[PDB]
Paper text:
E. ramulus and R. hominis also shared similar growth profiles on LNT, which was consistent with the presence of a functional GH136. The N-terminal (ErLnb136I) and the C-terminal (ErLnb136II) regions of the E. ramulus GH136 share homology to RhLnb136I and RhLnb136II, respectively, suggestive of the fusion of ErLnb136I and ErLnb136II to form an active enzyme (ErLnb136). Moreover, intimate interaction of the two ErLnb136 domains is consistent with the cooperative unfolding profile of the enzyme. These data justified the use ErLnb136 to study the architecture of the two subunits/domains compulsory for activity within GH136.
The crystal structures of selenomethionine (SeMet)-labelled and native ErLnb136 were determined at 1.4 and 2.0 Å resolution, respectively. The C-terminal catalytic domain (ErLnb136II, from AA 242-663) assumes a β helix fold similar to the bifidobacterial homolog LnbX. The LNB molecule bound in the active site is recognized by ten potential hydrogen bonds and aromatic stacking of the Gal unit onto W548. Moreover, the D575 Oδ2 of the nucleophile is positioned appropriately for nucleophilic attack on the anomeric carbon of the GlcNAc at 3.2 Å. The N-terminal domain (ErLnb136I, from AA 7-224) consists of 8 α-helices (α1-α8) and assumes a previously unknown fold, stabilized by the central helix α1. The ErLnb136I domain embraces the sides and back of the β helix domain. The Y145A mutant showed a 4.9-fold higher KM, suggesting that this residue contributes to substrate interactions, possibly at the +1 subsite.
Author numbering: 7 to 179, 200 to 224, 242 to 663
The structure:
């Protein structure tokens, strides 16, 4: 709320987080950040997909072939461009609120204004450990030792002290009314600037429409059910009116454009993005048609999805707000078989390769999916491939030329953004992954960029079964919030109580670059980066800060040909690198800032093979 924002900037001013903690100060930092990214970031992947999506694999090869640290001096002096290249007002406000909280969590000063900063004693931190054992078990139920979580407990206690100061300032509320009044005007201006930056045409208006209308702008349709019944054709557009709220509704589409005449779903008019408020409706039946990589993963069942793109092609969906809240009768939040829920679900099944599906500038929040299930279409955005009715007739279900750009996810469970999990998973159960597997079964030209993921129950961003995916210029914070026994109460036989930030699964020669991940929430994993099972993963030019499981993992015997170079890690906790049973990892020409009592190699995930050389390791 407005009083909490006011309070946060009062604390920012006392900590010296920003020079100008007025509403205008906020506006100017927002404009400066967006201008900086526009001036300094790479240009590839900005603007219309038709100008770049066929070149993803080429630009990946060019970047993988780099022989020196691009703009090393900016990286090393703290002026490099990374994370999302455009921050919406909502992304940017949340980014700064997280910055202020983390600055409190690391402040060493005696006072914040008249607040005496508490010094957490060993007895107090041990008391918290003994009272919160459900936060400190690992994948197999074994406890982190107190010594392994001491500094994390201190961070958590300082974050709670920060949150208590905010509630104190809210309770004690003159120049607050002034600050809030000006902020409201600044916010409205920022919304106008964001909005400016944005076949048959069908118009839908929840307020003004009628489903008996022809769907022109003057006589728009009323509901998404009417859209679900349209025989959309190549070149058609469906435009949902800004200010619309589609209560309990959903968009479930099975439509194909062409390359020359794609279909477009987007917004028209003035005001807030149209809101698809699915509230647990929008039921469909998911069935992969065979067991997945582990026999315990759930692979069939009903799913609720706000947007379902079922065998769609040559379709862009843009400028929608989506939620998918549960809370139906009989349901509890951590129930073992709570329904899987998606914001946007993509499915390939009966059309072989699906081409040219693009998501853009979606705001997806409060998707309350099953806490546990990893590969149902469960989370903010989840694209999967199911066994075809008749693969010999219609071909392998898979993706080509697919992008997810400029999306803001907040409070989605389980996944944030996941693209590519396939019924063909058992074809990839070797360490080395020949290109032929991707030619037959895998995805091509997959591009995930300029997204913002925050407050995610599980993993932030994952790409699966793709050749040379490019995952870049994404910002994340505070993922893996539910990967602990307090929320992960009834896993049954599914295990899976782990998450990392932004990572590839069973990809070939993936490139993850120019990403930013902060404040991952403790679990056995909880690092920013994860060269997981797959072949050739490269991370370069990524920024990580205050992740509770450290900087980067190399996970087990099928995580092969891993390289980690030209990254910056600032005050990651637990331990910087997690080479856990991996066969190789080349970790070179990075910069790490670690506390003396945070080890370079993380405890219990230290028995893999790696070459660490030419790294700059600073003590802080
Ligand atoms: C090899 C391994 O244990 N990797 C872990 C990941 O778990 C795998 O994730 C894939 C995702 O497609 C499948 O679910 C597979 O069955 C799992 O073994 C885990 O998701 C990540 C992040 O926490 O790290 C490893 O723990």
């Amino acid at each position: 709320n407005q009083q909490e924002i006011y309070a946060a900037y009062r604390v920012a001013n006392l900590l010296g987080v920003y020079e100008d903690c007025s509403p205008n100060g906020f506006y100017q930092r927002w404009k400066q950040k967006n201008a900086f990214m526009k001036a300094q970031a790479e240009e590839f992947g900005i603007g219309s997909t038709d100008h770049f999506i066929d070149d993803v694999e080429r630009i990946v090869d060019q970047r993988r072939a780099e022989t020196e640290w691009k703009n090393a001096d900016a990286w090393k002096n703290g002026t490099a461009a990374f994370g999302a290249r455009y921050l919406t007002p909502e992304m940017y406000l949340d980014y700064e609120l997280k910055s202020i909280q983390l600055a409190f969590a690391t402040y060493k000063g005696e006072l914040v204004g008249n607040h005496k900063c508490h010094v957490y004693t060993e007895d107090e931190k041990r008391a918290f450990y003994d009272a919160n054992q459900d936060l400190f078990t690992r994948y197999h139920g074994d406890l982190f030792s107190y010594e392994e979580v001491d500094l994390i407990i201190e961070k958590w206690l300082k974050v709670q002290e920060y949150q208590d100061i905010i509630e104190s300032v809210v309770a004690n509320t003159d120049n607050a009314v002034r600050w809030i009044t000006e902020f409201e005007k600044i916010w409205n201006q920022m919304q106008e600037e964001k909005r400016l930056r944005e076949g048959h045409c069908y118009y839908v208006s929840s307020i003004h429409g009628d489903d008996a209308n022809d769907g022109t702008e003057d006589q728009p349709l009323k509901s998404l059910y009417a859209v679900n019944r349209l025989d959309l054709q190549p070149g058609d557009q469906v435009l949902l009116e800004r200010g619309s709220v589609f209560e309990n509704q959903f968009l479930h589409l099975n439509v194909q454009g062409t390359k020359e005449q794609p279909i477009y779903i987007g917004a028209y008019g003035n005001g807030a993005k149209p809101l698809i408020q699915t509230n647990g409706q929008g039921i469909w039946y998911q069935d992969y048609g065979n067991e997945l990589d582990a026999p315990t993963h759930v692979y069939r069942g009903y799913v609720s999805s706000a947007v379902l793109l079922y065998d769609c092609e040559y379709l862009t969906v843009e400028n929608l707000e989506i939620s998918n809240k549960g809370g139906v009768f009989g349901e509890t939040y951590s129930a073992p078989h709570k329904m899987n829920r998606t914001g946007v679900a993509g499915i390939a099944k009966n059309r072989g390769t699906l081409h040219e599906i693009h998501l853009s500038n979606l705001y997806i929040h409060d998707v309350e999916g099953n806490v546990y299930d990893k590969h149902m279409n469960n989370g903010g955005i989840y694209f999967t491939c199911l066994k075809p009715e008749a693969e010999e007739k219609t071909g392998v279900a898979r993706y080509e030329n697919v992008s997810v750009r400029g999306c803001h996810l907040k409070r989605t469970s389980r996944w944030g953004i996941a693209v590519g999990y396939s019924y063909k998973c058992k074809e990839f159960m070797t360490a080395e992954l020949p290109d032929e597997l991707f030619e037959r079964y895998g995805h091509h030209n997959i591009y995930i960029a300029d997204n913002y993921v925050e407050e995610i129950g599980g993993d932030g961003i994952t790409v699966m079964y793709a050749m040379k995916p490019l995952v870049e210029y994404n910002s994340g914070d505070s993922c893996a919030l539910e990967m602990n026994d307090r929320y992960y109460t009834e896993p049954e036989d599914r295990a899976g109580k782990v998450a990392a930030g932004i990572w590839p699964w069973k990809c070939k020669d993936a490139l993850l670059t120019y990403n930013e991940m902060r404040d991952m929430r403790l679990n056995q994993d909880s690092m920013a980066w994860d060269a997981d099972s797959g072949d050739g993963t490269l991370y370069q030019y990524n920024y990580s800060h205050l992740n509770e499981g450290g900087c980067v993992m190399f996970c087990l015997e099928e995580a092969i040909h891993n390289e980690f170079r030209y990254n910056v890690s600032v005050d990651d906790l637990g331990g910087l690198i997690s080479p856990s049973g991996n066969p190789d990892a080349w970790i070179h020409h990075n910069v790490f800032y670690r506390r003396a009592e945070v080890p370079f190699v993380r405890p219990h995930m230290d028995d893999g093979k790696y070459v660490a050389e030419e790294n700059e390791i600073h003590l802080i």
